[PDB]
Amino acid sequence: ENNFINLYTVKNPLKCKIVDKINLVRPNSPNEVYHLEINHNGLFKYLEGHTCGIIPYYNIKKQRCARLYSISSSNNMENLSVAIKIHKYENITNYGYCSGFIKNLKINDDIYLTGAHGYFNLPNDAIQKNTNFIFIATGTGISPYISFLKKLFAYDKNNLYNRNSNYTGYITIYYGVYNEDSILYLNELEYFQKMYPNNINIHYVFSYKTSFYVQDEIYKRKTEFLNLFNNYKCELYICGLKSIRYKVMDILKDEKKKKRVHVEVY
Amino acid sequence: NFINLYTVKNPLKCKIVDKINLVRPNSPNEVYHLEINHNGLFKYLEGHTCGIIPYYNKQRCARLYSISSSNNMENLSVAIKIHKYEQTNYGYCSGFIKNLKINDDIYLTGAHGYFNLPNDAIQKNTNFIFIATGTGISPYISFLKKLFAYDKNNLRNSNYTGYITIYYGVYNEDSILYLNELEYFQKMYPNNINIHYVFSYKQNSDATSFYVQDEIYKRKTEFLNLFNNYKCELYICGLKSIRYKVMDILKSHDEKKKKRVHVEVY
Numbered sequence: 148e149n150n151f152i153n154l155y156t157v158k159n160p161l162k163c164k165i166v167d168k169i170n171l172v173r174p175n176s177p178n179e180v181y182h183l184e185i186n187h188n189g190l191f192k193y194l195e196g197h198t199c200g201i202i203p204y205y206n207i208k209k210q211r212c213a214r215l216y217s218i219s220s221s222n223n224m225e226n227l228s229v230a231i232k233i234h235k236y237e238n239i240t241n242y243g244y245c246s247g248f249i250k251n252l253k254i255n256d257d258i259y260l261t262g263a264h265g266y267f268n269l270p271n272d273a274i275q276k277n278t279n280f281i282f283i284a285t286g287t288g289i290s291p292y293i294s295f296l297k298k299l300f301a302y303d304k305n306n307l308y309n310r311n312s313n314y315t316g317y318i319t320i321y322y323g324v325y326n327e328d329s330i331l332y333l334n335e336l337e338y339f340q341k342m343y344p345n346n347i348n349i350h351y352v353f354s355y356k357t358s359f360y361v362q363d364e365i366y367k368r369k370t371e372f373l374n375l376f377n378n379y380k381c382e383l384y385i386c387g388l389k390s391i392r393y394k395v396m397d398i399l400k401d402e403k404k405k406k407r408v409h410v411e412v413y
Numbered sequence: 414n415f416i417n418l419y420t421v422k423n424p425l426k427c428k429i430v431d432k433i434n435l436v437r438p439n440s441p442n443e444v445y446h447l448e449i450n451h452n453g454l455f456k457y458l459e460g461h462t463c464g465i466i467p468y469y470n471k472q473r474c475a476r477l478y479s480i481s482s483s484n485n486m487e488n489l490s491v492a493i494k495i496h497k498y499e500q501t502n503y504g505y506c507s508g509f510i511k512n513l514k515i516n517d518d519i520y521l522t523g524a525h526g527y528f529n530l531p532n533d534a535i536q537k538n539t540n541f542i543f544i545a546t547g548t549g550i551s552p553y554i555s556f557l558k559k560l561f562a563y564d565k566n567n568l569r570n571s572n573y574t575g576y577i578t579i580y581y582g583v584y585n586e587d588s589i590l591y592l593n594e595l596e597y598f599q600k601m602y603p604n605n606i607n608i609h610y611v612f613s614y615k616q617n618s619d620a621t622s623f624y625v626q627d628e629i630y631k632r633k634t635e636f637l638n639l640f641n642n643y644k645c646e647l648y649i650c651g652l653k654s655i656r657y658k659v660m661d662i663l664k665s666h667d668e669k670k671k672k673r674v675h676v677e678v679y
């Protein structure tokens with residue numbers, strides 16, 4: 148620990164089985180996205196904030212080309228989660244490489260993963276320090292913050308009535324999708340806000356209705372927002388598309404005291 | 414019927430003739446224009462993409478890049494943005510092109526995509542509305558090159574007499590790709606081409622986001638006409654977003670003209 152990075156490469160993928168395959172979005176979201184419940188036998192080692200690689204079709208032509216997908220489960224969960232938007236052109240029409248693999252994916256199917264990737268992780272002392280957070284996400288970008296939240300708060304899906312252990316840090320989440328029906332992991336987000344009204348705050352920026360996104364909602368709250376960052380030393384986390392970085396970073400008006408600003412973009 | 418002439422199993426060995434930095438020094442981006450010699454063995458129509466296989470002859474895994482040249486010219490060209498991330502770390506094919514030198518071998522695929530001009534275009538003087546972000550300009554350049562019969566050596570001959578309105582969104586002036594070519598067409602054919610650049614840097618400050626599709630909305634009354642009144646083929650090539658607020662534009666002032674709208678986003 149924690150040199151989990153690259154325990155399984157494309158040179159040695161890990162046979163895993165699908166355990167569940169669930170639609171993350173309701174009928175009012177244009178996008179299609181599947182949460183995967185993946186059985187790795189406790190063998191696949193990873194760390195909240197980590198991405199895993201899936202090699203489409205691993206047993207024509209090869210076909211040994213992988214895509215990364217952020218894990219959205221806590222280390223502490225028997226099987227692991229992951230969320231995948233199906234990409235189409237341009238329904239019943241055409242698909243991207245991985246997209247199509249996952250579109251035809253069936254339960255108890257072989258899926259081949261690749262060792263931990265990335266460094267978007269939480270701080271190590273975060274759980275004891277009661278450290279504070281500002282998570283910023285678009286679309287599938289919420290994944291890491293779900294895993295983040297399953298850790299900070301007690302996860303158990305089967306024990307959702309207690310207790311639960313509290314990090315009592317303050318967490319502010321800016322989440323931007325198209326509409327309500329397009330927000331990944333609603334059941335959990337709604338639950339977290341419900342169980343911990345003094346620890347988690349969610350700002351949803353919806354695309355539908357010049358254009359207005361999550362950085363624009365962050366500017367519009369810029370005086371309030373900085374408090375969080377400096378007064379509560381709120382840790383900075385950006386995950387999603389490039390565009391987010393500039394408008395939130397250039398709102399800083401610094402010193403390698405900006406450390407803890409984590410930018411991940413895909 | 415040139416599609417798939419070449420595949421990862423029989424990739425066409427081509428050679429790197431040139432590698433021009435396509436951006437001026439104010440762009441945060443890094444894009445290289447490759448000029449690739451193939452012995453005229455690559456067959457494609459303007460608007461097709463080709464497949465590049467990084468480090469062929471590890472993983473044999475092609476990425477697609479829009480051809481920014483026309484059939485006529487001896488060599489094919491292409492433009493590549495170099496994708497980066499911090500935690501000096503590069504994309505797979507990006508890293509490949511970045512390290513790419515003059516007279517290197519480069520293995521292409523057969524062609525790809527259906528983002529083409531209609532078969533009767535020059536001799537039907539068909540109108541055009543082209544929407545693009547960043548590298549998405551490539552196909553339209555490819556078009557313009559044919560329609561106007563461009564010859565770097567000679568610059569005139571063209572019979573095409575239609576109208577071409579280009580909407581192009583980029584960060585700032587220095588980020589317009591193929592500015593040379595665009596600026597030329599604007600100058601040489603000012604009653605056959607009209608361009609609308611939409612620079613991203615302007616909205617950084619105390620304003621909300623404004624992208625290429627916003628300009629098309631702000632200019633919505635005119636846009637409909639260009640499409641309705643002028644029997645224009647509409648092309649969108651760039652980011653996912655461009656499409657709904659324009660598409661959604663088209664339902665206001667109906668369908669089965671569908672066959673006149675062409676989309677290719679990534």
Ligand SMILES: Cc1cc2nc3c(=O)[nH]c(=O)nc-3n(C[C@H](O)[C@H](O)[C@H](O)COP(=O)(O)OP(=O)(O)OC[C@H]3O[C@@H](n4cnc5c(N)ncnc54)[C@H](O)[C@@H]3O)c2cc1C
Pocket residue numbers: 198214215216217218230231232234235236237242243244245246247287288290412413477525526677678679
């Ligand atoms: C660090 C990191 C984390 C990531 N985490 C997630 C995540 O948590 N969840 C998630 O969903 N994704 C995530 N991604 C992106 C993920 O890898 C994508 O699924 C992948 O890059 C593209 O999907 P694909 O292979 O199905 O499509 P590709 O085969 O890569 O296709 C490329 C894109 O263009 C389109 N396209 C492809 N070929 C054509 C063609 N011939 N003509 C027209 N259009 C075409 C497709 O619709 C697709 O959107 C992450 C990426 C990174 C770098």
Ligand SMILES: Cc1cc2nc3c(=O)[nH]c(=O)nc-3n(C[C@H](O)[C@H](O)[C@H](O)COP(=O)(O)OP(=O)(O)OC[C@H]3O[C@@H](n4cnc5c(N)ncnc54)[C@H](O)[C@@H]3O)c2cc1C
Pocket residue numbers: 215264265412413462476477478479492493494495496497498500503504505506507508526548549551677678679
């Ligand atoms: C129809 C079509 C036409 C296209 N035409 C063009 C074109 O004209 N010009 C162009 O530039 N592109 C074009 N593309 C897309 C082109 O293939 C991209 O260069 C390619 O998708 C990026 O792959 P890569 O070589 O950067 O490596 P990849 O690894 O596939 O890149 C993955 C992305 O996530 C980042 N990333 C990779 N690994 C990690 C990691 N471990 N952690 C965090 N981030 C990571 C990279 O910065 C990159 O942005 C087109 C795509 C399609 C579908």
Ligand SMILES: Nc1ncnc2c1ncn2[C@@H]1O[C@H](COP(=O)(O)O)[C@@H](O)[C@H]1OP(=O)(O)O
Pocket residue numbers: 178285286287323324325326353354355360361362388390391653654657
């Ligand atoms: N430049 C941008 N900055 C912030 N959010 C964006 C940007 N472009 C698109 N989005 C939005 O991010 C959300 C999630 O995107 P996705 O589901 O494709 O990952 C969508 O609501 C999308 O809105 P839009 O409807 O304008 O595309």
Ligand SMILES: Nc1ncnc2c1ncn2[C@@H]1O[C@H](COP(=O)(O)O)[C@@H](O)[C@H]1OP(=O)(O)O
Pocket residue numbers: 389390546547548582583584612613614624625626652654655
């Ligand atoms: N939702 C969106 N709709 C249209 N254009 C966008 C959107 N998000 C970003 N862009 C812009 O597309 C242009 C192409 O750049 P690239 O595709 O390399 O990011 C950029 O100026 C980028 O703006 P931004 O400056 O906000 O990133």
